[PDB]
Each structure stands twice: as structure tokens, then as C-alpha cells.
Amino acid sequence: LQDPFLNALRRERVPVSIYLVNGIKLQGQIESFDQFVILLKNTVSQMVYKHAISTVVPSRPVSHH
Amino acid sequence: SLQDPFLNALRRERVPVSIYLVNGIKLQGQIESFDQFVILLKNTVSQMVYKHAISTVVPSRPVS
Amino acid sequence: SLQDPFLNALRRERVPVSIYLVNGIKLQGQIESFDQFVILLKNTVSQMVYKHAISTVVPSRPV
Amino acid sequence: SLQDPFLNALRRERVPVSIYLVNGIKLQGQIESFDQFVILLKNTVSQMVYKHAISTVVPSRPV
Amino acid sequence: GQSLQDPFLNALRRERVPVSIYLVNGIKLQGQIESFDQFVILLKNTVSQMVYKHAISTVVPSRPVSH
Amino acid sequence: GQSLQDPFLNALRRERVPVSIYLVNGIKLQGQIESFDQFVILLKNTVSQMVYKHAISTVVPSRPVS
């Protein structure tokens, strides 16, 4: 589920909200991702460790997961 | 496994659930789908929840 | 393997327990079943608790 | 080659200890037994503590 | 090469880009990435400190870094 | 060096440098690194306390260590 879900968000360049395990909310678009991290873009590309992520919430409906 | 049949029952019966995160935050919705690492929870949009950030999955009502 | 016999004892005897999560929050009920990754705790409904989010399992009385 | 000899000495000598959890909570008692994943701590009852939720084990005296 | 993580931290290290590393607690560390392995990142400032990746939420470059 | 963690901790233990170990909850521990293995670090002060690496966020030497 994970690969198809993130790939879709990446392909459609959908604005997303990534919430961390501390409650903090990051926003931007998914540039790329691998087994352990997600590169999130906004002013700069920041590397987010999936282990610190709780949820990835599309800013709008995204068909075909 | 106990996890799969529990989540599969909830998904199949479209039982509204509360998913508590390890930080105490509570998410609500219906389980759309899930794999070994995540659960897609539906409400306005489908959000992807990482199981490693989940503490407990509480059905809103008994599930056979 | 201490886990299995410890949880089995609690389940078998239907001893009320307190499961403290890693955020400090306490859950209570009886252990219905469990596997390598989760424990099904019962009270009003059966709720699925991920062991990775559990800090300690405390029985309400000696077992 | 450290964790086990450290835990065994504590259990063997029944040294009172404080186990700090990652949430800040401090548990106290004597280590009854342990395996690769949990530690059984005794006080009023035996509670099962998950090592993944433990931050530090502080003996109450030099061991 | 095989991950996004290696090339990304290598770029930062190589370019000696000042960075901010946010921990799961919320503390914000800063400095330059001296080195890193499978499990930790050495961050330099007054001293080299060792940060466990499992405690890291994000690594944010202070400026755009290409490639 | 395939591992960075091992030589870093070893230098600290060898030189007996006072360090600060910050835990994931924000709490800070201090003392000297007596020993360590794959999963824990033995920190000394009044007593030897066993710290699980998975609970550690950062190890900060109190001074430069060559």
C-alpha cells in the first residue's frame, strides 16, 4: 500500500501534510522516498525519517492508490 | 496472526474506529485497506497511518 | 520466552490487568488473546494493542 | 556481552532497582527474570516490562 | 546510490552545508555533518556529538543542495 | 570505517571523558562511559546505570576528543 500511495502523491505533486510522532506537522510535496525516508520539498528539500512519521494526509482526494 | 483478521473484520464491516497514536492523538474513520506497515484510514481523504506510530485500534462497536 | 507464559497465565485466569503504553497512558481490561505483535484487550469492546507501544503489563493481583 | 551479565548480577543479588521508561515513568523493585525482550519486575505483583520501553536501569547500590 | 539517505547526507557532508537536525522530542540540533553510518550521524559544532538516527525526525539543510 | 559508533564510544571510554547522554524524552544523563555493547551503554557516576541505545538521542562529549 505504501509504495503506491506515496508514488501517486509524488506523481501528481499533491500538497501533503506529514505528521510526526511528536504531533508536529510538516507540509510540502513528496519529491522522492526510499525504504527509510521521504524527501519533502518546500523552500528546501528536507529528509524525513519514516520512523518519526505517524501520518501522511493528502491535501485533496487522490485517486488510484 | 490475530492482527490481520481483526483489521480485516473492521474493514469488511466498515466499522468506524478510533486509532490511537503513540503520542495520545486519536484518529477516527473507517479502515479502507492495510498492509504490514500501514493502515489507510478514510474520512474526508484517505490518510496513511504507520502502524509503528499506532498504540491501539478501538472498534466503535463490537465486531464478531 | 517469558512473554508467552506470562500473558497466557493472565488470559487463562482472566485476571484484570493494566497495560501502560509508551506515552504513559494506562489501558485496563482482560487479555483475550495475543500473538507476536499485538494483544487483544477486552472491556466494552475488544481493542487491539500493539506490543511495540506497550511499556509494561501489570496484573491487578498476584498470579 | 554487557546487558546480560549486568541484569543477572542484579537478579542474583536481588538488588533493588529503578527502571526508567522512555515516558519518564520510574518503576522500582527487584528483577525476577528476563529474556531477550522483557524484564519481570517484582514488587506487590510481578509486572512485565518491555525492554524497548526502558531507558535506563539504575541499581540502588553498587553491584 | 541505493538509498536517498546516503547521497543526501553525503552531499551535505561534502558541501559542509550547515544543517538543522530535529529530534523526535523537538530539540533542534545544528552544525555540520561530519560523518555518518548505518545507525548514527556525527554532528560538529563546538564538539562532535553522536546523534542516533532512530531519534531523528528530520534533517533540514540551511540552503538548497543540488544532486 | 564501517562503524562510526564503535570508535566514537571507545574513544570516550578509553579517555574517560565526562559525557552528557540525552534521552528521547529530553532527560539528560551524565558520567563516564565505562563500557558498551550492541544495545546498551554502561554509564558511571554514583553507580553504574545501564542505558539502552534505543532510548538515547545524542551523546555529547564535554570536550573535544581526537
Give the residue from D43, E49, B45, D63 showing the smallest Cα distance to F58.
Answer: E49
Structure-determination technique: X-ray
| Binding partners of D (≥3 Cβ pairs within 8 A) | C, F
Say if the Cβ atoms of F5 and E50 lie within 8 Å: yes
The HSE-up count of residue B18 (CA atoms within 13 Å, CB side) is: 11
**B5–chain C nearest CA distance, Å:** 11
Q: Residue with C-alpha cell 501534510?
A: A17
Q: Which three cell numbers stand for residue B39?
A: 493502515
Nearest to D22 among F43, F50, F55 (CB): F55
**E14–chain A nearest CA distance, Å:** 17
- Cα–Cα distance list, A6 to A18, A40, B22, B48, D47 (Å): 11, 11, 22, 9, 41
| Binding partners of B (≥3 Cβ pairs within 8 A) | A, C
The whole-angstrom separation of Cα A26 and Cα A6 is 15
The whole-angstrom separation of Cα A38 and Cα E40 is 18
The whole-angstrom separation of Cα F36 and Cα F46 is 18
Contact of chains F and C by CB distance (3 or more pairs under 8 angstroms): no
Burial of C18: CB neighbours in 10 Å, binned 0-12, 13-18, 19+? middle
**E31–chain A nearest CA distance, Å:** 15
DSSP state of B15: -
Residue B13 has φ and ψ, to the nearest 5°, of -85, 0
Residue F31 bridge partners (DSSP): F19
Say if the Cβ atoms of C59 and D46 lie within 8 Å: yes
Nearest to C37 among B3, B56, B57 (CB): B3
Say if the Cβ atoms of B22 and C46 lie within 8 Å: no
Nearest to F63 among E27, E47, E50 (CB): E47
Question: Number of folded domains in chain E?
Answer: 1
Specified resolution (Å):
2.2
For residue E38, give its domain range.
1-67
Say if the Cβ atoms of C59 and D52 lie within 8 Å: no
Looking up residue B47, the CATH number of its domain turns out to be: 2.30.30.100
B22 and C23 Cβ atoms separated by less than 8 Å: yes
Chain E residue numbers touching A36 (CB-CB < 8 A): 3, 5
Q: Which residues of E38-61 are buried (b: 16+ CB within 10 A; e: fewer)?
A: eebbbbeeeebbbbbbbbbbbbbb
Nearest to B52 among A1, A5, A51 (CB): A51
B60 and B18 Cβ atoms separated by less than 8 Å: yes
Say if the Cβ atoms of E56 and A35 lie within 8 Å: no
The whole-angstrom separation of Cα F27 and Cα F23 is 5
Nearest to B40 among A1, A59, A60 (CB): A1
Burial of B62: CB neighbours in 10 Å, binned 0-12, 13-18, 19+? exposed
The whole-angstrom separation of Cα D12 and Cα D33 is 9
**F12–chain E nearest CA distance, Å:** 11
DSSP E strands in B7-61: the ranges are 17-21, 26-34, 38-42, 46-50, 54-59
The whole-angstrom separation of Cα F52 and Cα D57 is 9
What amino acid occupies position C9?
A
B16 and B4 Cβ atoms separated by less than 8 Å: no
Number of H helices, E strands in chain B: 1, 5
